[PDB]
Design a protein around this ligand. Sequence first.
Ligand SMILES: CCc1c(C(=O)Nc2cccc(CCC(=O)NO)c2)[nH]c(C)c1C(C)=O
Ligand SMILES: CCc1c(C(=O)Nc2cccc(CCC(=O)NO)c2)[nH]c(C)c1C(C)=O
Length: 127
Amino acid sequence: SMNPPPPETSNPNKPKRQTNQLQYLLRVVLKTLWKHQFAWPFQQPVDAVKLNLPDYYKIIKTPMDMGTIKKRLENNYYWNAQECIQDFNTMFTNCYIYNKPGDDIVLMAEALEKLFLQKINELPTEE
Ligand SMILES: CCc1c(C(=O)Nc2cccc(CCC(=O)NO)c2)[nH]c(C)c1C(C)=O
Ligand SMILES: CCc1c(C(=O)Nc2cccc(CCC(=O)NO)c2)[nH]c(C)c1C(C)=O
């Protein structure tokens, strides 16, 4: 069994930007979620080999995780905050698609997602 290559965190053909919203997304949103009690299963790409999940990358074709998002934010990979918010939303969506309602991993995603939504409800106005 093989894992796909991870999502890219650098691309010299992609224009980069730093905005107050993206720095809020790193300094407040990512950092808070990273330190959460249930953040461990989301801090790196799903290793479907080691977790013996051979259908995972059969079913999930846009994988995403907070390790990738952290590296994208640290590298200023994004142009705008919506790009980064979409990556979080994809991470959560994948978990809910692949797993079953009420699974442990889904209960953990639920907690992180509730905090995520509280933080982006207060996304600062673009300056
Ligand atoms: C249930 C499987 C799953 C994990 C996980 O169980 N993740 C995990 C658990 C313990 C430790 C670590 C860090 C070391 C490592 O990466 N081992 O492979 C990750 N996460 C996600 C997003 C999923 C799925 C399919 O939605
Ligand atoms: C798997 C059922 C479930 C969902 C769900 O199915 N959730 C979902 C599915 C697809 C997309 C999205 C939006 C992701 C997003 O954009 N977050 O910001 C959510 N949630 C929860 C909390 C559960 C539980 C406890 O069983």
